[PDB]
């Protein structure tokens, strides 16, 4: 084509609508009963989805309330750019294909956005992954003390129940829920806060003050299937357990998310790194 | 008449004013002491008022804070249209004259708005029914151990005590109050929250996580005269009892409401389906 | 069934989701290219859709930004209930089946909500009609000198472009658009304001001060195909033409809407009352 | 009675409701066609109503959007208390029975609230005066280039058309409207701003900068029947005419309002000070 | 003077400023140590101030956060006008000179504003009373478990500590504080809520549901010196004690306030009705 | 004193109140008619007040709407600290006693806050200077063709005319007004916007795009008595004249202010640097 | 230079940017591990930083969330100017060079702004002091049982986690943190509220009611290293200890701050007035 004399092939508006609709319809029908739902597309949730979907047989829905995925991983600290990842999580960066400046006990990715865009590109390309962005998980499906999926709505509806006539949610059944809701914002820690309000867990003390050396090891260690059918990963772990926060460093999110992914595979009865069967 | 050359008969502005004033103020005088007040015109409250007002002896005031009645029954889930009603509540739809597409354990009304408009149209035509919309129930009338009506105001006043000099409420005495306030919004669960703040009940746990099979049977079961003079119906039942929620399905709202209406007839000493005397 | 011992047939959450999704997305595909789109489900828009859809050949989509349809027709004036309809528009009420208390030059419907629910119930039951509520028309489709449909989005999105990353709209092609957006609210007069901002008309003076005798005859008279492909009806007519307003009387809305429907049938080449071929 | 052992006579809640309702109903029926409506109960509007209602045969409705009447006359300047009134308007204070500290060219009432409460008490006691507080004039009634009354609503509705489904206004016919809307607030200058938007006057330049000596004489001089059926008085005069403001002094408001009252009597064909017939 | 040819005597702007300033200064100096401060100028606070200041030797400061005094006594219920006062409180109306329509167990003042304006006019005329409107009591002065006055600020500052750099309060010492803060609004029940937060009282259950017959007698009975140096009166009594509310009736406010006034006189060691020494 | 065993001398709350009241109200009386009022205590206004008040004959009131004085001079750009001052304005820094790091065509003050605090400390110590902070100039006093002072109120009142009953302003007469209101914020360019709305100047184009080399020389040049009685200085000059802006450099503000001060001395008939008589 | 013909030396925009960037980022690197961080630049925090930085060996970072430093020390009470300082804290004023009007048990600084500007000017000139304004301390660094610095962000970010994708904080390590966050505003008492939410202290009762004689001595007394690594000073002490407040008097803030500074020097192992080694 010539950028100086450019013509698009013709279109009809109604075709564009119908293509989008049909495709979103079929996705919602498929994923109404899914193997894994990941709630939250921050560094931890992306890392978990990336790890799980390496198994091509596993269906992965990602529910993200924001229009943009990525969570807090578009920046470092104080609106600066550099992303510090402590060793040995730089091996995870190697696998995804993200360059870094190597230091002695850590590496520096030149922009957090480079990690986030790269992992998302590789993740979203896979046929077994679907991103439902601009959609919130408002609640859980819980039957006989097992989490069995999530209660969904458009994110803007979920934040506007006070300004309109009622707007019921939808429902997505899942074998395993990976809750990766962070701590930040009006949606922070949605999943663990709901476990508490329905009496399935007893306390959500909230994250403690900052201590990077304690926090990152603790967050990985504490990542687990918290109740039957629900794994918690990322900063949401610190909320439920009262672990210290780590601030502007990203290794624990990546590793927590990877561990959560392997826990989800285990929960599905599939080869996994938790068992040593992978 | 001719749509091409159309003339309305003459009017005067004063006539319009006086018509609306004389009629509304007459209705307020009529209903200031009444048989039943239904608080909330959602699916459960409309169903309750519909059921009660089948008896002509019985005067029924419906108090609805929104300008529009209907509550959460203008939509299905995720801003979609279809209204799922589990059997055998399709027999209630048959009685009201709402068509549906039948499936094995449920039916589908093509638009929630078709239910709501249809039942409202039949209900409002009745001479013993009065809709006071744009009016909130701010509080209860309680004398000794018994609910004896509601404390009312324009909904916008009830929402703007923070912005103007004080604006006292009005009062409506009733033999029975049917509280159908839902759980959603700033007015969610007004009646049961008030029973708790005045010490007449102990807790309002809030609805639990979603489980349609448990929730709908539970809401019907738990629909009751909670304290002397006050029946609670619809999702407000889940709030008081800590029942699971059901999300985008509507049978329990209709049946809970119908049961609440029958309980109100029984409380008034009238033939009813609770006793088997209807 | 027994209200004392009540059991719903079994369900699964996934069934409810898939039912609502399959049906809504099927409707969107059906109506993405359609015969008539009515924007606004107030008294004028409901009247127009009611009139058009008397012809079964004609597919009619109603776009309503609010969750609740009905517009300003849930109340009379000053939050009072009575709906004044000047003669001879009481003949339209007769046709729809809405009772009234007759006076000399007008009739009184006991509650505006009785009109609105009744006409909606009859309208929505029809197979050729689809209500897309909680959906705003953000813009028009205009090709050359002609309106060819509407640009749509969830209403909450259309109201929240200031708070999230961009969220493109959808598109619905139509042979005729009937714009019935009122004057009230942030969406008041959307269609005529847009004709002005794209240069297809010159001014939108806004409604003038109140004069019922002038206003209602004027609104009917001025109801028209304003530009090729687009009819304007109801109070949106006053905005474009600088007509006086009428306040709490509703005959002109019903008759303007009826005339707009007949004008749409005429524009589609069908038997109609404008020509005298119905 | 004994303040140490006090018992009220018994009451029924429904009686209180019915008394308020019946009385407000009859007032609204009476005043739906009134001789004078005064819009705004600030110092100018109170002064105008006080002057007019000295004729016991003249019906006076006062429409005030705030719950509290009094407008800007509860304080002096900068939240201080003293009310400066230039001579010879202290003669007006003498008539109403408001004490002052007399200085050479002006007097000082010790609290603006003393003037406001005193004039209101004397005004409201009269049988031909009715105060409709918490009610806004949203618009005018205009028929054939004469103002014929006002379009009313509850004030909170008039400020909330953007948050609810539409809420039509009511209407009050009047022989003469006295617009006394001030300049301050979101309702400031309602009446003259509407004259401009409907093309009945051509410009509303807004008040000029402060100059007490020019402003107070000018405001009195310019008080007039601005268009047929509508007198403007008080600070709203400065808005329409572009007169200077006067800030924390009150004589012109009192005298403007008195003049407006005498102009209203003249407009009604009654003895008055404008003609020298009183 | 001639309303047709009117001239004010000359003024200088700076004189107006200086008069207001000097006068407000001297008032604030005088009242920085006062005999009684009444917090809240609603029906109860006005009634208390009116009762106390019948003793010309007693200094009374009234602190009212709103620009307009009067509290909730500008209206009846539901924005209607009539003020119901149960017998025998109509004797209080007789004393103040407020007309009413006499019924069997109650009387009806035609507009609540007639009571409020009349009592305020008589109250404010007295030399020993000062109204500090647009000023909030933010806190109490408490020394050795006795209330010794109030912590004040301009009301707008008291509501804007979140939008500006810090703005310290002022202080007013008092022999007795009469707290009459109502229950309504963001300032509702200021005085009793502060007693609770500083541990001087133990519970503030809040007002119970409506029951006029119980409430009005209870409110009068419970009006008292709650802690040394502080009397509570009006609806604030119901907040501290958990008494029922009474809604749109005004006798208890008047009588509570009168009793509070006589309690204040007693606390000052002066002749009073509590002792039978008056 | 001993920080380990520290006792303050005794106080009484009333003393503190009376001290603050007597002093402030005395200052208001002093300055109600004054020589110069400076509106705005940003870098330009502080510089102007500093320059003028070098003459002891001259009384200078500074009106600043914010609680904190200093305007935009607490920071450099992008929330960084360093304050760039182009030569030869470093000579003004020398005079005030502000250190800097010298470069070739400019100097760097280490923190903008060091300039602002330093100049304020020297300015405020002077007996002829009074800072009225938390006070806005809402309007001008204009008599005939000449500015003669300012219309003042508490800043929060000036921002809350939409939320309360009216609150009149106060007035300060001045021989000269120096308007230094900046361009930023809701109060940006108050003085020049007012000249335009009262018709004394024709346009306020607003500042143009950034060009430091053009802008700083232009702002100094254009600093002038714009209309009789009123000098405009600082970025408010760019707004009136359509000059380019300079962004994060401060020399023009200091020099414009100094020139404005010299112009004020000249206007007062005093020795000045404009004429060469200083 | 000539104010009549004024030319600035040339500049380039890039130079200004690079100057501000290089300097700020150099300061951030310097202070990322530092001796003392003072959180809050109100009267107590400025006094503490002033006291500490008398020792040149000691690096002191001041973190202030507002753009303007100074806290509540720009005004006295009720937006009045005079700053009351009880003796013997006037000796601290003597040392800083702030003039006052002496009384018997206290002195009066003519404007609070004179104190604040003066102390800031002396403080900020010192080479060992850095003001990071527009920067909030969001959290603490806590390792084991000890506070080791602060978690920082731009203040606007710290206030806008609800409106944007996540924005991680930054970190500053410190040997000692002096928390001087006041009680006022959304950031009031940040440090002590955090000690409570992480479980390091048990309660934050909040300040009690006003009692100047008790409060000021108590605040000095209670100023302490509350937990290892963290001193609390100023009104934040009242919040943690439930001390009474003092309102518009400032001696305790200055003395508490001075004591806090001496406690910080002692904690650093340096000569100090707590020990008597200074
Ligand atoms: Zn109330
Ligand atoms: Zn819901
Ligand atoms: Zn777009
Ligand atoms: Zn309207
Ligand atoms: Zn004003
Ligand atoms: Zn700027
Ligand atoms: Zn975070
Ligand atoms: Zn404070």
UniProtKB/Swiss-Prot annotation, chains A, B, C, D, E, F, G:
Tissue expression remark: Expressed at high levels in chloroplast-containing parenchymatic cells of leaves, inflorescence shoots and flowers, and at lower levels in the vascular system. In young plants, detected in roots and shoots including cotyledons, leaves and hypocotyls. Also observed in apical meristematic regions, siliques and embryos. Low expression in roots, limited to the vascular tissue. Broadly expressed in roots, cotyledons, leaves, hypocotyls, inflorescences, siliques, and strongly in guard cells.
A single GO BP: response to cold
Subunit field text: Homooctamer. Interacts with RBCX1 and RBCX1. Interacts with CPK33.
Stated family: Belongs to the THI4 family.
Span of the entire protein shown here: 51 to 328 of 349
EC numbers: 2.4.2.60
Keywords (A to Z) from UniProt: Cell membrane, Chloroplast, Iron, Membrane, Metal-binding, Mitochondrion, NAD, Plastid, Thiamine biosynthesis, Transferase, Transit peptide
Primary location group: plastid
Organism phylogeny: Eukaryota, Viridiplantae, Streptophyta, Embryophyta, Tracheophyta
Catalytic activity: [ADP-thiazole synthase]-L-cysteine + glycine + NAD(+) = [ADP-thiazole synthase]-dehydroalanine + ADP-5-ethyl-4-methylthiazole-2-carboxylate + nicotinamide + 3 H2O + 2 H(+)
Modification note: During the catalytic reaction, a sulfide is transferred from Cys-166 to a reaction intermediate, generating a dehydroalanine residue. Not phosphorylated in vitro by CPK33.
UniProt KW Ribonucleoprotein keyword: no
Induction: Up-regulated by osmotic stress, sugar deprivation, high salinity, and hypoxia. Up-regulated by abscisic acid treatment and drought stress. No effect of thiamine, salicylic acid or paraquat treatments. Down-regulated by dark incubation.
Protein name per the record: Thiamine thiazole synthase, chloroplastic
Encoding gene, per UniProt annotation: THI1
UniProt-recorded Gene Ontology molecular function terms: cysteine-dependent adenosine diphosphate thiazole synthase activity; iron ion binding; protein domain specific binding; protein homodimerization activity; zinc ion binding
Ligand binding (substrate): 44, 64-65, 72, 137, 168, 183, 235, 245-247
Modification sites for 2,3-didehydroalanine (Cys): 166
Entry's localization field: Plastid, Chloroplast; Mitochondrion; Cell membrane
Cofactor note: Binds 1 Fe cation per subunit.
Known function: Involved in biosynthesis of the thiamine precursor thiazole. Catalyzes the conversion of NAD and glycine to adenosine diphosphate 5-(2-hydroxyethyl)-4-methylthiazole-2-carboxylic acid (ADT), an adenylated thiazole intermediate. The reaction includes an iron-dependent sulfide transfer from a conserved cysteine residue of the protein to a thiazole intermediate. The enzyme can only undergo a single turnover, which suggests it is a suicide enzyme. May have additional roles in adaptation to various stress conditions and in DNA damage tolerance.
One cellular-component annotation, GO: plastid
